């Protein structure tokens, strides 16, 4: 963590909400665009511990696929966490606003980058607990950076592994389940997992053995990989090292992605 003087920061627009403050877009001194989370007067001891703890963990991460911390303001009030800014925004909204605009290889490359960031976090003994496309930022090189904006607080049942829902067992292996959901989010351009099923219906379907069907136009290898992320038995899921290795090999032999999984049509259209 670098300590930044408040005279170097200008808050411009509110872009979100913090636990005890606001999240802004701004400029950091030529100027550089930044995102800024503040801790406002009246914060509790616990909030200060969590806020500066968050800053400390982010300063420890140095990876291509993890959001970069520019610095912290801790010596003056209000306190601030300052990161790089991504004009393309969060991955879920990005894909939904750009439906069908990318190649299969571009989509799989986004997944490889997300997996590499997650392998790094898991190796550093950091369990994310809220991996979803809404918590991934996209830069102007299409590079995805794992982030955590806090709960949307809506609990993300349909991204969470059964053991984490059932008995609060959050590990890198429950993050692997979440990663499989993110794979499905990417390959569908941001569709809502399980569509209109309620949270209870999703849990019931998973316990009964159902799994999300293949996205349209999805490489067979990619659907196979996401399905193995959704094994009920935690020990049977791939580790992030396995996921990175597979995605890297598929990208480097790109003909491997041309074999597509069968898509199950809901609608039959008959014509001559
Ligand atoms: C200011 C800020 C503070 C904290 C984080 C954040 O990701 N923190 C965090 C906490 C725990 C673990 C991780 C980890 F592991 F990297 F994923 C990150 C990100 C940001 N940056 C951003 N937040 C937000 C943002 C938006 N809406 C609500 N909250 C934050 N939007 C951003 C950025 C950057 N660009 N954009 C478009």
Give the three-class secondary structure for 23. Answer: strand
Name the structure determination technique. Answer: X-ray
Whose Cα sits closest to atom 22 in ligand 1? 35
Nominal resolution (angstroms): 1.3
Give the three-class secondary structure for 120. Answer: helix
CB neighbours of residue 47 within 10 Å: 16
Give the three-class secondary structure for 71. Answer: strand
Residue of 130, 217, 242, 262 marked active site: 130
- Cα(79)–Cα(39) distance, integer angstroms: 5
Backbone angles phi, psi at 183, to 5 degrees: -55, -45
CB neighbours of residue 153 within 10 Å: 8
> Tokens 């041309």, residue?
258
CA of 258 to the centre of ligand 1 (A): 35
CA angle (194, 118, 206) in 5-degree steps: 25
Which ligand 1 atom is at minimum distance from the Cα of 36? 1
Of 23, 147, 150, best ligand 1 pocket probe by most atoms within 8 Å of the beta carbon = 147
Domains of the chain with bracketed CATH? 1-86 (3.30.200.20), 87-272 (1.10.510.10)
264 catalytically annotated: no
Tokens of 113: 């980058």
């Amino acid at each position: 963590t670098t300590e930044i003087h408040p005279s170097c920061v200008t808050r411009q627009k509110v872009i979100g909400a913090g636990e005890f403050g606001e999240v802004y877009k701004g400029m950091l001194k030529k100027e550089v665009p930044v995102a800024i989370k503040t801790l406002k007067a009246g914060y509790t001891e616990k909030q200060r511990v969590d806020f500066l703890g968050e800053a400390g963990i982010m300063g420890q991460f140095s990876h291509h696929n993890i959001i970069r911390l520019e610095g912290v303001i801790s010596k003056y009030k209000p306190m601030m966490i300052i990161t790089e800014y991504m004009e393309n925004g969060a991955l879920d909204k990005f894909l939904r606003e750009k439906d069908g605009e990318f190649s299969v290889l571009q989509l799989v490359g986004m997944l490889r980058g997300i997996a590499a960031g997650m392998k790094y976090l898991a190796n550093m003994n950091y369990v994310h607990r809220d991996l979803a496309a809404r918590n991934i930022l996209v830069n102007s090189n299409l590079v995805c950076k794992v982030s955590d904006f806090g709960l949307s607080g809506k609990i993300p049942i349909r991204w969470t592994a059964p053991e984490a829902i059932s008995y609060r067992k959050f590990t890198s292996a429950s993050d692997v389940w979440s990663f499989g959901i993110v794979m499905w989010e990417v390959m569908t351009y941001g569709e809502r997992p399980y569509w209109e099923l309620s949270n209870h219906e999703v849990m019931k379907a998973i316990n009964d053995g159902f799994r999300l069907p293949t996205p349209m136009d999805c490489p067979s290898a990619i659907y196979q990989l996401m399905m193995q992320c959704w094994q009920q038995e935690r020990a049977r899921r791939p580790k992030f090292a396995d996921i990175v290795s597979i995605l890297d090999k598929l990208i480097r032999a790109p003909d491997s992605l041309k074999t597509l999984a069968d898509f199950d049509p809901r609608v039959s259209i008959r014509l001559p």
